[PDB]
Design an enzyme around this catalytic site. Structure first.
Site, short mmCIF file in Angstrom:
data_model
loop_
_atom_site.label_atom_id
_atom_site.label_comp_id
_atom_site.label_asym_id
_atom_site.label_seq_id
_atom_site.Cartn_x
_atom_site.Cartn_y
_atom_site.Cartn_z
CG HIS A 49 -0.40 -0.06 2.52
ND1 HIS A 49 -0.52 -1.17 3.33
CD2 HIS A 49 0.31 0.84 3.24
CE1 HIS A 49 0.09 -0.96 4.47
NE2 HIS A 49 0.60 0.26 4.45
CG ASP A 79 -0.46 -4.64 2.14
OD1 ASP A 79 -0.23 -3.92 1.15
OD2 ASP A 79 -0.52 -4.21 3.31
CB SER A 139 1.53 -0.66 8.23
OG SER A 139 1.63 0.52 7.45
#
Ligand SMILES: [Cl-]
Ligand SMILES: [Mg+2]
Ligand SMILES: [Mg+2]
Ligand SMILES: [Mg+2]
Lengths: 179, 179, 179
Positions: A49, A79, A139
């Site tokens: 992302h 991801d 993240s």
């Protein structure tokens, strides 16, 4: 109390923190997220992302160095994304132990950048679940045990965080480097 | 780092995790919450709220076994309930230590099912207050120290969780079995 | 398990908890927040926000004693305030170690009153950042390591808490006492 030492997980931090970097976009400059230096070759894992809709990728180490990064490839399902930078002499790499087996209950620090932030918790379950707080910046960051060994890659159920197992992450990285 | 061992609370998990079960409703099947196997007789504590409006109660152990459960009784004030299942040979029971005294600061794991989830924290205060995250599923679940000994029963102030003292919970259970 | 001892941070709590007090307003009586007894002279740190719009300040110790407090002064920038109470014989003071150096990863308990509440976490970074939950009451409260030594003053980014370094807090207090 001056004689005695305070219980701490600092050792793990010194071992793994240099390897974790800040990821950026590029005049306009924005902060994207976190990333982890896997090896000397200069390969760096991060979330898919953060990379998306990025024209120029930039990486920032804890020692002050700053690189331009190349997108090696990503993986929609997990991801994840891998990046490449010119490997100077003595890059800080994330400690990895292929032998270690992650057990539920293990102490784990989460490292990233919602500057650099270290949260603490345990392996709630093994995808990997943890109660070390995971925000937007951390993240793409690392998740290591007390020894400092890499256990997972943070990703994005309140109080519940998710990391990708390091072994699986390792395999994904190898394939992306290939394909 | 391969030689050294990572600080962990895994021992406690192996000791107490088998005793904690998933609770269900029943074709239609729904997930209600968590529960704890107290003794060999087959008595299981859980929250009053999960049991209410349940036509058929089902219990699921971590080893794969699955039972039909009977409602022994509940207690409105403490939001507790006891259940009964036919006791096979060698039921996993929650470790209990009537002698242990819960002190503030004690490390505590919270076990339940917001699959099975283990969060970590400490005894914030002694009703019992803890900062191990408590969601909807882990309500009715166990709360044990590092040794694995039962300390409380999770129930339902952000960041603040509540467990019923194990001694009190023990007494309530005995009365319900009677009355 | 009765022989073995459960991992705990109770020692730290007994050492530092008596020093942390409840702060109040004053018939009308309201709860304002937390505070910390620095020295025998009777000086107590707390947040600037709790003190503001207070006609009468009251302090409550963990042993049951209750005082009227005087506002020594505050500091807008750091949201701090100092208070004074008549020092009886043997006031409980917060343990301080000017020599100790706060490292990232250190275990830290947060003490205050969102009754009295003890949360656990680590030093996320050094302003000081921690993942011990910080609510409204525990603001103005203490933040100590495992040894019990004072590390910071809680103040008011989910999951992220802020404490003022104890050394800095110490210096601010000295100046306010003067000015
Ligand atoms: Cl936490
Ligand atoms: Mg946490
Ligand atoms: Mg917690
Ligand atoms: Mg915490």
């Amino acid at each position: 109390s001056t004689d005695e030492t305070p219980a701490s997980y600092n050792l793990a931090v010194r071992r793994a923190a240099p390897a974790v970097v800040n990821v950026y976009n590029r005049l306009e400059i924005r902060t994207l997220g976190s990333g982890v230096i896997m090896d000397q070759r200069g390969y760096i894992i991060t979330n898919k992302h953060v990379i998306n809709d990025a024209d120029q990728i930039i990486v920032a180490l804890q020692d002050g160095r700053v690189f331009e990064a190349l997108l090696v490839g990503s993986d929609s399902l997990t991801d994840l994304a891998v990046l490449k930078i010119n490997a100077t002499g003595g890059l800080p790499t994330i400690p990895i132990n292929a032998r270690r087996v992650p057990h539920i209950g293990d102490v784990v620090l989460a490292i990233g950048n919602p500057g650099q932030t270290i949260t603490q918790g345990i392996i709630s379950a093994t995808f990997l679940q943890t109660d070390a707080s995971i925000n937007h910046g951390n993240s793409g960051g690392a998740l290591v045990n007390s020894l400092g060994e890499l256990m997972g890659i943070n990703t994005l159920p309140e109080g519940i965080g998710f990391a990708i197992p390091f072994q699986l992450a390792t395999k994904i990285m190898d394939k992306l480097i290939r394909d």
